């Protein structure tokens, strides 16, 4: 998994050398930003259910047809909406992992790799997830740098979807 630390190590190793002071300062940079990131992770996690429920509702209100169009692909059913909330929670959970390791690595590997293929194959609209993420950004209620951290990763996901 790519983190500021594993990344600094892979670069030093690819050059057969000890870490550089530049790389130590880089890791110090992650240690410094971690307080804000861990606070964002804690907050999103304690509010996970209401964020997820509220995000799914927001997608259902914006894309009425998804809960209407009855087929395997739409949340027109209990299973359909359950998978939707489950997907939404996966996004939230990935966001907290990114915060925890200080990099997009967890989301890149567990969710973004293969995202295009899965959304295409199961006809899932990236726009649905964009709305869920916008909802979380507008709803987590974080402040200061913990909020910046949270939003930076939520925006990263939004960008992977558009």
């Amino acid at each position: 998994m790519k983190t500021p630390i594993t990344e600094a190590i892979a670069s030093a190793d690819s050059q057969g050398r000890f870490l550089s002071n530049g790389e130590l300062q880089s890791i110090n940079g992650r240690y410094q930003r971690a307080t804000a990131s861990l606070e964002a992770a804690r907050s999103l996690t304690s509010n996970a259910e209401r964020l997820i429920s509220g995000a799914a509702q927001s997608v259902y209100s914006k894309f009425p047809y998804t809960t209407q169009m009855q087929g395997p692909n739409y949340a027109a059913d209990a299973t359909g909406k359950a998978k939707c909330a489950r997907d939404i929670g996966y996004y939230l959970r990935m966001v907290t992992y990114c915060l925890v390791v200080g990099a997009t690595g967890p989301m890149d590997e567990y969710l973004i790799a293969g995202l295009s293929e899965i959304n295409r194959s199961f006809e899932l609209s990236p726009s649905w997830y964009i709305e869920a993420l916008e909802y979380i950004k507008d709803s987590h209620a974080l402040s200061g740098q913990a909020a910046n951290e949270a939003n930076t990763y939520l925006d990263y996901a939004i960008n992977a979807l558009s």
Binding site: M1, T3, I5, T6, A8, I9, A10, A12, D13, G16, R17, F18, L19, N21, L24, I27, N28, Y31, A34, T35, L38, A41, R42, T45, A48, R93, T96, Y97, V100, V101, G102, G105, P106, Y110
Partner: protein, 172 residues
């Protein structure tokens, strides 16, 4: 590869769970010892050629047969490969140390090393002695408060020693 943070996240993911507040606090304990962990890594980087060379010098004073004609460290190509291995182990131990996880060291360096030295005829017990001398030198540097605010790093120095020990046991 994984650092300590990523290891906790991978375990959590496979279980479908958010990290608990306990896990978050344990990672905050790692963040709090970060400056110290950086000092230890900086000590190793800043003294790398001495840790390696002085350790190799002591190994060859204790075991002259390695450098006598026919020995595994005789000829400059072999002497140089031997010093490079000490440096490679030292680099990997320092990576494990900044990662706070032995994964990079076990995976990219130790795995298969025992078999490699046996195939080459390099005496593994001599390599482990070399690695133990580098550990002694590094831990001595690490316990040296000159150049750092005074404090207790016994927990980090113990962890550093564990990485060295993993390497020494792996070569034989």
């Amino acid at each position: 590869m994984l650092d300590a943070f990523a290891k906790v996240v991978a375990q959590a993911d496979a279980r479908g769970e958010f990290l608990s507040n306990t896990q978050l606090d344990a990672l905050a304990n790692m963040i709090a010892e970060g400056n110290k962990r950086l000092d230890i890594v900086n000590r190793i980087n800043s003294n790398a050629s001495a840790i390696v060379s002085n350790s190799a010098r002591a190994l060859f004073a204790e075991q002259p047969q390695l450098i006598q004609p026919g020995g595994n460290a005789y000829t400059n190509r072999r002497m140089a490969a031997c010093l490079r291995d000490m440096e490679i182990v030292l680099r990997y131990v320092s990576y494990a140390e900044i990662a706070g996880d032995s994964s990079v060291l076990d995976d990219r360096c130790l795995n298969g090393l025992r078999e490699t030295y046996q195939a080459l005829g390099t005496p593994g017990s001599s390599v482990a002695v070399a690695i133990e001398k580098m550990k002694e030198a590094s831990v001595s540097d690490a316990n040296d408060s000159s150049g750092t605010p005074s404090g207790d790093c016994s927990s980090l120095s113990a962890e550093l020693g564990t990485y060295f020990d993993r390497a020494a046991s792996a070569v034989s």
